[PDB]
CSV table of C-alpha atoms in Angstrom, one decimal:
chain,number,residue,atom,x,y,z
A,4,UNK,CA,-93.8,-225.8,-0.9
A,5,UNK,CA,-94.5,-229.2,-2.2
A,6,UNK,CA,-97.2,-227.5,-4.2
A,7,UNK,CA,-94.9,-224.7,-5.3
A,8,UNK,CA,-92.3,-227.0,-6.8
A,9,UNK,CA,-95.0,-228.4,-9.2
A,10,UNK,CA,-95.9,-224.9,-10.4
A,11,UNK,CA,-92.2,-223.9,-11.0
A,12,UNK,CA,-91.4,-227.1,-12.9
A,13,UNK,CA,-94.4,-226.4,-15.2
A,14,UNK,CA,-93.3,-222.7,-15.6
A,15,UNK,CA,-90.0,-224.0,-16.8
A,16,UNK,CA,-91.9,-225.5,-19.8
A,17,UNK,CA,-94.4,-222.8,-20.4
A,18,UNK,CA,-93.8,-220.5,-23.4
A,19,UNK,CA,-94.8,-216.8,-23.8
A,20,UNK,CA,-96.3,-216.6,-20.3
A,21,UNK,CA,-96.9,-212.8,-19.9
A,22,UNK,CA,-98.7,-212.7,-16.5
A,23,UNK,CA,-98.3,-214.6,-13.2
A,24,UNK,CA,-100.6,-213.9,-10.3
A,25,UNK,CA,-99.9,-215.7,-7.0
A,26,UNK,CA,-101.8,-213.2,-4.9
A,27,UNK,CA,-103.4,-214.5,-1.7
A,28,UNK,CA,-101.2,-217.6,-1.4
A,29,UNK,CA,-98.3,-217.8,1.1
A,30,UNK,CA,-94.8,-218.2,-0.4
A,31,UNK,CA,-92.0,-219.3,1.9
A,32,UNK,CA,-88.5,-217.8,1.5
A,33,UNK,CA,-87.7,-221.0,-0.3
A,34,UNK,CA,-90.5,-220.6,-2.9
A,35,UNK,CA,-89.5,-216.9,-3.3
A,36,UNK,CA,-86.0,-218.1,-4.2
A,37,UNK,CA,-87.3,-220.6,-6.8
A,38,UNK,CA,-89.5,-217.9,-8.3
A,39,UNK,CA,-86.5,-215.5,-8.5
A,40,UNK,CA,-84.7,-218.3,-10.5
A,41,UNK,CA,-87.7,-218.3,-12.9
A,42,UNK,CA,-87.4,-214.5,-13.4
A,43,UNK,CA,-83.7,-214.7,-14.1
A,44,UNK,CA,-84.1,-217.1,-17.0
A,45,UNK,CA,-83.5,-215.5,-20.5
A,46,UNK,CA,-86.6,-217.1,-21.9
A,47,UNK,CA,-88.7,-215.3,-19.2
A,48,UNK,CA,-91.2,-213.1,-20.9
A,49,UNK,CA,-93.3,-212.2,-17.8
A,50,UNK,CA,-94.6,-208.6,-18.1
A,51,UNK,CA,-96.8,-208.7,-14.9
A,52,UNK,CA,-96.1,-210.4,-11.6
A,53,UNK,CA,-98.6,-210.1,-8.7
A,54,UNK,CA,-97.5,-211.3,-5.3
A,55,UNK,CA,-100.0,-209.4,-3.2
A,56,UNK,CA,-100.9,-211.0,0.2
A,57,UNK,CA,-98.3,-213.7,-0.1
A,58,UNK,CA,-96.6,-213.4,3.3
A,59,UNK,CA,-93.5,-211.6,1.9
A,60,UNK,CA,-91.1,-209.8,4.2
A,61,UNK,CA,-88.1,-207.5,3.8
A,62,UNK,CA,-85.6,-210.2,2.9
A,63,UNK,CA,-87.9,-211.3,0.1
A,64,UNK,CA,-87.5,-207.8,-1.4
A,65,UNK,CA,-83.8,-208.3,-1.6
A,66,UNK,CA,-84.2,-211.5,-3.5
A,67,UNK,CA,-86.8,-210.0,-5.8
A,68,UNK,CA,-84.6,-206.9,-6.5
A,69,UNK,CA,-81.7,-209.1,-7.4
A,70,UNK,CA,-84.0,-211.2,-9.6
A,71,UNK,CA,-85.1,-208.0,-11.5
A,72,UNK,CA,-81.4,-207.1,-12.2
A,73,UNK,CA,-81.2,-209.1,-15.4
A,74,UNK,CA,-84.9,-209.0,-16.4
A,75,UNK,CA,-85.9,-206.6,-19.1
A,76,UNK,CA,-89.5,-207.8,-19.7
A,77,UNK,CA,-91.3,-207.2,-16.3
A,78,UNK,CA,-93.2,-203.9,-16.5
A,79,UNK,CA,-95.6,-204.4,-13.5
A,80,UNK,CA,-95.1,-205.7,-10.0
A,81,UNK,CA,-97.6,-205.9,-7.2
A,82,UNK,CA,-96.3,-206.4,-3.6
A,83,UNK,CA,-99.3,-205.1,-1.8
A,84,UNK,CA,-100.6,-206.6,1.5
A,85,UNK,CA,-97.2,-207.9,2.6
A,86,UNK,CA,-95.2,-206.7,5.6
A,87,UNK,CA,-92.2,-205.4,3.6
A,88,UNK,CA,-91.4,-202.6,6.0
A,89,UNK,CA,-89.1,-199.7,5.2
A,90,UNK,CA,-86.2,-202.1,5.0
A,91,UNK,CA,-87.9,-204.0,2.2
A,92,UNK,CA,-88.7,-200.8,0.3
A,93,UNK,CA,-85.1,-199.8,0.5
A,94,UNK,CA,-84.0,-202.9,-1.3
A,95,UNK,CA,-86.5,-202.4,-4.1
A,96,UNK,CA,-85.5,-198.7,-4.5
A,97,UNK,CA,-81.9,-199.7,-5.0
A,98,UNK,CA,-82.9,-201.5,-8.1
A,99,UNK,CA,-85.7,-199.2,-9.4
A,100,UNK,CA,-83.3,-196.1,-9.5
A,101,UNK,CA,-80.9,-198.0,-11.9
A,102,UNK,CA,-80.9,-196.7,-15.5
A,103,UNK,CA,-81.5,-200.2,-16.9
A,104,UNK,CA,-84.8,-200.6,-14.9
A,105,UNK,CA,-87.9,-201.2,-17.1
A,106,UNK,CA,-90.6,-201.4,-14.4
A,107,UNK,CA,-93.5,-199.1,-15.2
A,108,UNK,CA,-96.1,-200.0,-12.5
A,109,UNK,CA,-95.5,-200.8,-8.9
A,110,UNK,CA,-98.0,-201.4,-6.1
A,111,UNK,CA,-97.0,-201.2,-2.5
A,112,UNK,CA,-100.5,-200.9,-0.8
A,113,UNK,CA,-100.5,-201.8,2.9
A,114,UNK,CA,-96.9,-202.8,3.1
A,115,UNK,CA,-96.0,-201.4,6.5
A,116,UNK,CA,-94.2,-198.3,5.1
A,117,UNK,CA,-93.4,-195.1,7.0
A,118,UNK,CA,-91.9,-191.8,6.3
A,119,UNK,CA,-88.5,-193.4,6.8
A,120,UNK,CA,-88.6,-195.0,3.3
A,121,UNK,CA,-89.7,-191.8,1.6
A,122,UNK,CA,-86.2,-190.4,0.9
A,123,UNK,CA,-85.4,-193.7,-0.9
A,124,UNK,CA,-88.7,-193.5,-2.8
A,125,UNK,CA,-88.1,-189.9,-3.7
A,126,UNK,CA,-84.7,-191.0,-5.2
A,127,UNK,CA,-86.6,-193.4,-7.4
A,128,UNK,CA,-89.1,-190.8,-8.4
A,129,UNK,CA,-86.2,-188.4,-9.5
A,130,UNK,CA,-84.0,-191.0,-11.3
A,131,UNK,CA,-86.1,-194.0,-12.5
A,132,UNK,CA,-86.1,-194.1,-16.3
A,133,UNK,CA,-89.4,-196.1,-16.4
A,134,UNK,CA,-91.7,-195.7,-13.3
A,135,UNK,CA,-95.1,-194.4,-14.3
A,136,UNK,CA,-97.4,-195.6,-11.6
A,137,UNK,CA,-96.8,-196.1,-7.9
A,138,UNK,CA,-99.5,-197.0,-5.3
A,139,UNK,CA,-98.7,-196.2,-1.7
A,140,UNK,CA,-102.2,-196.4,-0.2
A,141,UNK,CA,-102.7,-197.8,3.2
A,142,UNK,CA,-99.3,-196.8,4.5
A,143,UNK,CA,-98.7,-194.3,7.3
A,144,UNK,CA,-96.4,-191.8,5.6
A,145,UNK,CA,-97.4,-188.5,7.2
A,146,UNK,CA,-96.5,-185.0,6.3
A,147,UNK,CA,-92.8,-185.6,6.8
A,148,UNK,CA,-92.7,-188.5,4.3
A,149,UNK,CA,-95.1,-187.0,1.7
A,150,UNK,CA,-92.9,-183.8,1.7
A,151,UNK,CA,-89.9,-186.0,0.8
A,152,UNK,CA,-91.9,-187.6,-1.9
A,153,UNK,CA,-92.9,-184.2,-3.3
A,154,UNK,CA,-89.1,-183.3,-3.5
A,155,UNK,CA,-88.7,-186.2,-6.0
A,156,UNK,CA,-92.0,-185.6,-7.9
A,157,UNK,CA,-90.9,-182.0,-8.6
A,158,UNK,CA,-87.8,-183.2,-10.5
A,159,UNK,CA,-88.5,-182.6,-14.2
A,160,UNK,CA,-87.0,-186.0,-15.0
A,161,UNK,CA,-89.7,-187.7,-12.9
A,162,UNK,CA,-91.7,-190.0,-15.1
A,163,UNK,CA,-94.6,-190.6,-12.7
A,164,UNK,CA,-98.1,-190.0,-13.9
A,165,UNK,CA,-100.2,-191.7,-11.1
A,166,UNK,CA,-99.5,-191.7,-7.4
A,167,UNK,CA,-101.8,-193.6,-5.0
A,168,UNK,CA,-101.6,-191.8,-1.6
A,169,UNK,CA,-103.7,-191.7,1.6
A,170,UNK,CA,-104.4,-187.9,2.1
A,171,UNK,CA,-107.0,-187.9,4.9
A,172,UNK,CA,-104.6,-187.5,7.9
A,173,UNK,CA,-102.3,-185.1,6.1
A,174,UNK,CA,-102.3,-181.5,7.3
A,175,UNK,CA,-104.1,-178.7,5.5
A,176,UNK,CA,-100.7,-177.2,4.6
A,177,UNK,CA,-99.6,-180.6,3.1
A,178,UNK,CA,-102.8,-181.0,1.1
A,179,UNK,CA,-102.4,-177.5,-0.3
A,180,UNK,CA,-98.8,-178.4,-1.3
A,181,UNK,CA,-100.0,-181.5,-3.1
A,182,UNK,CA,-102.7,-179.6,-5.0
A,183,UNK,CA,-100.1,-177.0,-6.0
A,184,UNK,CA,-97.9,-179.8,-7.3
A,185,UNK,CA,-100.8,-181.2,-9.3
A,186,UNK,CA,-101.3,-177.7,-10.9
A,187,UNK,CA,-97.6,-177.5,-11.8
A,188,UNK,CA,-97.5,-181.1,-13.1
A,189,UNK,CA,-100.8,-181.6,-14.9
A,190,UNK,CA,-99.7,-185.0,-16.3
A,191,UNK,CA,-99.7,-186.3,-12.6
A,192,UNK,CA,-102.8,-187.7,-11.0
A,193,UNK,CA,-102.8,-188.3,-7.2
A,194,UNK,CA,-105.5,-190.6,-6.3
A,195,UNK,CA,-106.9,-192.6,-3.5
A,196,UNK,CA,-109.8,-195.0,-2.6
A,197,UNK,CA,-111.6,-191.9,-1.3
A,198,UNK,CA,-110.5,-189.6,-4.2
A,199,UNK,CA,-110.6,-192.2,-7.1
A,200,UNK,CA,-110.5,-189.4,-9.7
């Protein structure tokens, strides 16, 4: 946190910074709050923010979601490899389904998510004005959650074109349903580490 205060005082002076990648370094709740201040500034021109493997938890998602409320420049956010839990995803979803949201690309790989966040995610898929890519690999969503996701993906207003999803432990019936969706929505690619396609 010593350290983090140096970085944030410098960012206050930086101009035109489009990307900020903190991945792999732990941020305390307190550093998260100073970062959220950074994002709220009107001069903030960040387009990409990467916080993967940073020790974030659910309460951090609430702060990030509120920090995105004003922001119109961020188009890509990586929260992979943090124990966000379903409660953390729910805070993000509240923001991402708003009509002012500009976020295009969101990565939630290995974030401790279950089927219990998938109704919230599906409401994002159906209503977000901006979300094009969503990576949910390394989360245990199961047939129940993926079915809920598919209910949102089927919405003709769904903007998504790339979904990252673990398919190995899904049922044969679920995998047939996903392939049927891909046939109906040819602009959508469902990929994984095992089906990189």
